[PDB]
Structures are given as C-alpha cells and as structure tokens.
Amino acid sequence: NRRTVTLRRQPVGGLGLSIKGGSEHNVPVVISKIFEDQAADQTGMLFVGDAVLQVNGIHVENATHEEVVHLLRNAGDEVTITVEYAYTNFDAERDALNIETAIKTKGVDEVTIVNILTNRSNEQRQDIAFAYQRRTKKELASALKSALSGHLETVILGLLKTPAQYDASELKASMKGLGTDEDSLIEIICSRTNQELQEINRVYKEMYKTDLEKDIISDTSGDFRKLMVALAKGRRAEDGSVIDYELIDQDARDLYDAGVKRKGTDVPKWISIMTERSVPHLQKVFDRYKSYSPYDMLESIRKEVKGDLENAFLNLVQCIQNKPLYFADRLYDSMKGKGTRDKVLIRIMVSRSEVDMLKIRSEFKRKYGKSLYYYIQQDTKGDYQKALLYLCGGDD
C-alpha cells in the first residue's frame, strides 16, 4: 500500500492532519488525525494509520518526530508524502548499519548516532553491538571511542555498557588512586537494590579480577567502611505482605536510643537497622522516628555524625524515603550553579533512563517549577545536550 499523495497547503488547517510516533520512541511516524474537508481529507488517499515514509522524496522511515514535523512545515504550498498502511535482529542490523554509515561519514554524523543509541533500551544496544561487530569486524565501543569526543563520548560509551558493567566501572573509577570520590561511591552503593548489587559484584569480579568488597575495604576507613561493605553485600531484607508494626516502633526507639538520646552514637546499631531492614519497613520507621525524636532521621544524622559517614547516611535515607526525588535533587545540584557537574549529570541520566526516569521528572517538576528537560537545555549544548534530552524522554 505504498501510496504517494500530493497535499496542497491551505489556510484552513494547513495540511489538515496530525501525526504521532517517531524514531525517538522507536516507532514509525503515523498519521494520527485527518480533519475532515481539509487538505489531507480532500486528497482521498490519506487514512488514519498511514506510516509516513517520504516527504517530497526525502526518506523519513527512520526519522524522529520533530524531523518529520520540520519537513512538513517547510515543504512549500505543494507537499508530496509517500505513505503505507517487538525489536528483532533485523532492527539491530539496520541500527548497526546506520551507525556504521554515520561513523564512516567525513566529520562523523553524531546526530544519527545520538538518535539511535539514546532511544534504544540497554538490551537493544547490546543487540546493536553484536550486529555491528558481525558486519564490520570491529567493536562498536572502540569505534565510537575514536569517532566521538568530549562529554558526548562519555554518554555514548556509558550507554553501551550493561547496567552492571557501567555501575562496576563507575565504582572502580571512584576509588582509583589515592583520592576516593566518596560522593560517586556513595551515590551508587546507597541507591542500588539487592538484585542490582549482586549483579554488580559478579561483574566487578570479572572485569577487575578482584572482589568489590575487597576494593571498598582498601579505600575506605572507620565506620564509613563498615557502612559501605554492609550496603554493597546487597542482602537487605525483601518485604512482603507483612507490616511488622511492633518492629517499626522498636526500630524507631532503637534508632533514637542509639543517637540523639545518648552521648555519642551507637553507629553499629544504625548500620544494622538501616541496611538490614527492607525499604518499605524503614520508610515507616523514619515516620515513627518523628514521633519519638524532635528531629527527623536526616537532621539527626547531621547532629550525630560528620564527614563521609554523615554524607553516606544522608544519601541512604534519601534513597529509602524517596529515591526518584533523591536523583531529582542530585540532578538539580549538578546544574543549579556555575558550569555543570557533568560526571553526576551524565551518570544519573545514563543509569536511571530505563529505571524510574518518569518519577524523577515528576519529582523534579513539582519541586523546581521547571522541567528536568528545561534545566538540561539551559546547561548543555550540542549533540551532548540532545543525547541527554533523549535520555530524559521528553519535556515535563
């Protein structure tokens, strides 16, 4: 049903149609509406559900939504459209072929590379990497490493790793050398779940020929070391349909009796409770803690401990209470001031794009008035900005 139709742009409705879809959602652009008696309806050959393949002979079978909207608005008074009424290995090969063409183009076509990779799931990017190596005999990561540069290179190479590989390599990078990036180490260890950590530990073993727990011990000290080792084990309790109200109250008293009530801090009891109890349980514990203590769990942490141990406890409680808001706040910090903390911004957008990016955007918009898309737009430029915007998934 490959039909080629010429529409005449008219003041009453323009082209007289609506379109939905686009390669940013990995779907073909499809005619959404056809306003009756207007241009698209007058032709008699356009129907709701037609996939848009060409605009004035310009191929758009793999174009984004804005690219097709931009073509249809600049095609003149006479617009000619060619229409026709599960991710497979074919899609991987076509994606891998287009990425190969964009890399071999003189000057590198970064737009095409960003259009595809930032709009595929992590599992689909592995299928693309498998097909790219079959067709070119080259590794896609190393090909893009020399073809790209700057922040865009950091995003694309990070997107190519599996969730465990990316987390493991980021963990290794935070402890590399004498200067341990405690903030990056804290962000990953406090926010990852049991299933994610068990996979990180397994992959960290393969990539670096040593245990993650053994490397944490070598770069951390004191109670901060005990907190990261216990969290990195990923043996937190899994909650069921059992709300143990008696334990919620006793855990709150124990947290209060171990900190604000006594001189000093019984941090082993803090580490024991906050790392072993399930997340839904600890959420109700922290509210029950407000009934016994004049300060909430976060303020009690600021009053009891200092240094990296304070920073880790502050991040853990935020992840337990509201993890999407936790990432929304860290994204805002990465862009609020002069310049950009690109390491945090890139890592969050890469690691959370497929997890809870919608809930992060919802918390961000509610608290900061503007969208996460908007702040990314004002802090980054170029294809690096477009890649982050695609990982954001849309405005608001």
Binding site: S18, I19, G21, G22, K33
Partner: peptide
Amino acid sequence: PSTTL
C-alpha cells in the same frame, strides 16, 4: 505524542 500540521 501528536503534532497537527
């Protein structure tokens, strides 16, 4: 996700 033209 639709745009009218």
